[PDB]
């Protein structure tokens, strides 16, 4: 539900609406399915969907020296 | 037979500023026609598909936002962060990168984000990436600026010191590399000082933003007159539906609400039509942005007054609200010369030709120099090559040409 | 009936004047008048500089300078024939207007 | 392991035409719709922004 | 109806253009202010000027 | 008869030397390789 607070219609409040049926998870990856504010959705390990704030791929610290 | 050539160069730090996205908007369309009026909402469905289409176009437009954005700062598979130790001889960046004490966002995204700036049936949604993510990803695309040059954008990332790679962006402009190192001092003051004045720039006035903030008013005043639009009578006895549901029986008052839902739908209709217009206009932004990113971020292009107005050394991106704000390190030459030259010179009976650059003397011994910062150097056989009889050259000059072979006379 | 044209903020006296500054600066000056301060350079010497940038040997231009400038004057020649006999070249913009 | 390699060349002239600007133009809406008729102007209101 | 109409058409083509004079001044920065090294765009050949 | 670099775009036969030509490799590896005989520009004055 875009833009309402979950009050008002598993759940899991968004920046982008109230999300139900998916799990929230704080691990981090690629964006599956997105959904909005840094939130995407994929389905996931007895498997179910799950949401998660999106990660822009791997960091990587470049091995730089002068 | 006169050639000024310069003998010195500024480095000039040329801000260009790019739209990128628009605010993602929606119009529930029957709720902006008919407020739940039942009868109105009916009086909707004779007019047929026109609501579902609003919707779809309106639709088309968001989902390009963030793709548009997309396009613009996802050029690159990992995020790259700095290294802790800011070795990078004499440029301090210190200004463009991340300052962590917040979002990550650096010093001078943060005076960007400073100087920018009801619901029938409207709604925003939010941008798929956070403002945060977009400051993760011009992170991204600057740390692997300094650290690792065009190498990012062609598959794998490679370190490489940063005079380094300034040294292979100036033989990019045809400046030779020692013109570099040999001013490294220099060149780090003039570099640091134009990122210094980039703050004023941005700090003093407004109207630097104003292709940013002409996109934000723009949206405001189409949705500010959109719903203004919804009080407007269309020549009905009403603009609000309550009074015309009271006042009237259900047959007059279809009538009245089709003068209302007519009237409001050809609004609805011209604020898309403009917004599809607009957003086309948007696109091809983030399409030149995205090259921008591209040639200019991710390489050097050799494209004149594409990447800022010099001969262009790189460039970084600084993440802006619905834009993108890149500050185009150009190399400009600034003190020059005359000289005289001839396009060739003539020795032992045979023209001789500058391998790289230009002859030129101060009318008195000739010297060859790079034709984009002076540098006298001796001629020789070695900085030249031969081409046939001294005669059909128009305009060649004479000289005894130096054989680095002449001392050797040991066997 | 309601309708209003406005002149353009440029006159075409200026048109004439940029167009005329643009090409005395390309004369003149190579690209140098793009990348800031312009600086003369004489035209056959410019010439060999344009030569080297599609891969032939600046050698190539002087030997052959005067066969080089009488190919492009009689082009520009062929330029002022082919415009002043036909209409159907300026398409795009009759087509603007119309 | 054949190349054909140019003796000789051409300068060419080629023209190019492009578009820069429609002539700009304004219409007074209320001019165009009425022509001056008090009774036509005070019915445009009613149409809004 | 034909007021809105014809504005409508007039921003098609007012962006049709704004994409013309883009190209337009980006020839005149590649083409006329510098050499092209992008084959056929200053015209079908190597570019001189 | 006469084997010659030239340069790419117009053809400007030159006798093949040391200065007009880099080594790489050994003779065997590349798929199209041709004999000759590559002058020497510092042979004459090693004659002094
Ligand atoms: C090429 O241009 C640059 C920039 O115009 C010249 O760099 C430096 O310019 C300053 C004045 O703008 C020179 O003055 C001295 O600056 C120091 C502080 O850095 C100050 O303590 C002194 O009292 C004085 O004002 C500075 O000497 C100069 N740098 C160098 C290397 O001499 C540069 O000189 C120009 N190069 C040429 C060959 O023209
Ligand atoms: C004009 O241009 C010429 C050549 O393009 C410059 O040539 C200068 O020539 C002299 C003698 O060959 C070089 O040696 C030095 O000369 C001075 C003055 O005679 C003397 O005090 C030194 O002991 C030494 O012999 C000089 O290095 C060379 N200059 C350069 C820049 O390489 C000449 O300087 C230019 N200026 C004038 C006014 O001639
Ligand atoms: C560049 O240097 C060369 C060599 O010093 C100059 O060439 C020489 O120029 C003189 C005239 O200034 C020639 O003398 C004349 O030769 C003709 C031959 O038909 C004769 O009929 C005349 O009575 C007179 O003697 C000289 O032969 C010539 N030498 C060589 C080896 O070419 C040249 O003038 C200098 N300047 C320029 C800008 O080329
Ligand atoms: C490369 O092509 C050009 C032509 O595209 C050759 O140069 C010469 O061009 C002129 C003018 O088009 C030709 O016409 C005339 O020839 C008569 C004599 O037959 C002469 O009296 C006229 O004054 C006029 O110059 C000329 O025939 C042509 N020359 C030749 C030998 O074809 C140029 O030679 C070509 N380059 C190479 C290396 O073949
Ligand atoms: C370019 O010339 C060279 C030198 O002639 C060719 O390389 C090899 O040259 C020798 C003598 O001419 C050929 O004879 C054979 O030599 C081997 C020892 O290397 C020996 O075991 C045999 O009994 C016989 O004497 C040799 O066949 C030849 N190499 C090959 C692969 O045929 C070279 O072939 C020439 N380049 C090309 C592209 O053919
Ligand atoms: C959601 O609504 C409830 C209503 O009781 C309120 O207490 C809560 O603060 C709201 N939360 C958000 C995130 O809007
Ligand atoms: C996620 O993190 C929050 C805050 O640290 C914690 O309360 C929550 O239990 C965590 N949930 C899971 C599934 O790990
Ligand atoms: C070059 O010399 C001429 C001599 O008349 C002068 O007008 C011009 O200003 C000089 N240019 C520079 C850059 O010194
Ligand atoms: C111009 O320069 C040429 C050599 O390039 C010289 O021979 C000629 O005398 C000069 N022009 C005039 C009109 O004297
Ligand atoms: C082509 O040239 C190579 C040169 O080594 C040779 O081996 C090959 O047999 C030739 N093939 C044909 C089809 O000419």
Redesign the pocket.
């Known amino acids: 539900y875009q833009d309402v607070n979950c009050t008002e219609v598993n759940v899991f409040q968004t920046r982008a609406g109230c999300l139900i049926g998916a799990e929230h998870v704080n691990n981090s990856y690629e964006c599956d399915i997105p959904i909005g504010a840094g939130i995407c959705a994929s389905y996931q390990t007895s498997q179910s969907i799950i949401a998660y704030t999106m990660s822009l791929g791997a960091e990587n610290s470049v091995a730089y020296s002068n | 037979n006169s050639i000024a050539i310069p003998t010195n160069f500024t480095i000039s730090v040329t801000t260009e500023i790019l739209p990128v996205s628009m605010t993602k908007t929606s119009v529930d369309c029957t709720m902006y026609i008919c407020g739940d009026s039942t009868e109105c909402s009916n009086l909707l469905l004779q007019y047929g598909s026109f609501c579902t289409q609003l919707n779809r176009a309106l639709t088309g437009i968001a989902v390009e936002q963030d793709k548009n954005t997309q396009e613009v700062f996802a050029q690159v598979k990992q995020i790259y962060k700095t290294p802790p130790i800011k070795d990078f001889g004499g440029f301090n960046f210190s200004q463009i990168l991340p300052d962590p004490s917040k979002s990550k966002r650096s010093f001078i995204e943060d005076l960007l984000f400073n100087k920018v700036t009801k619901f029938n049936g409207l709604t925003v949604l939010p941008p798929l990436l956070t403002d945060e993510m977009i400051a993760q990803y011009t992170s991204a695309l600057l740390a692997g600026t300094i650290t690792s040059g065009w190498t990012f954008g062609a598959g794998a990332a490679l370190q490489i010191p940063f005079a380094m790679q300034m040294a292979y962006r100036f033989n990019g402009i045809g400046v030779t590399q020692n013109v570099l190192y040999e001013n490294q001092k220099l060149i780090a003051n003039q570099f640091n000082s134009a990122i210094g004045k980039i703050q004023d720039s941005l700090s003093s006035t407004a109207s630097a933003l104003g292709k940013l903030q002409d996109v934000v008013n723009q949206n405001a005043q189409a949705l500010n007159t959109l719903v203004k639009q919804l009080s407007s009578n269309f020549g009905a006895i009403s603009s609000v539906l309550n009074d015309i549901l009271s006042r009237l029986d259900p047959p007059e008052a279809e009538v009245q609400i089709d003068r209302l839902i007519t009237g409001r739908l050809q609004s609805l209709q011209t604020y898309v039509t403009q917004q599809l217009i607009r957003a086309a206009e948007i696109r091809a932004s983030a399409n030149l942005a995205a090259t921008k990113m591209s040639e200019c971020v991710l390489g050097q292009s050799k494209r004149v007054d594409f990447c800022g107005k010099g001969y262009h050394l790189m460039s970084f991106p600084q993440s802006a609200p619905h834009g993108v704000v890149f500050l185009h390190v150009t190399y400009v030459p600034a003190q020059e010369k005359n000289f005289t030259t001839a396009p060739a010179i003539?020795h032992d009976?045979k023209a001789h030709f500058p391998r790289e650059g230009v002859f030129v003397s101060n009318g008195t011994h000739w010297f060859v120099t790079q034709r984009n910062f002076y540098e006298p150097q001796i001629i020789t056989t070695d900085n030249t090559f031969v081409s046939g009889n001294?005669d059909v050259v128009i305009?060649?000059?004479?000289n005894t040409v130096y054989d680095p072979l002449q001392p050797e006379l040991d066997s």
């Open positions: 003539c009976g001294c305009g060649i000059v004479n």
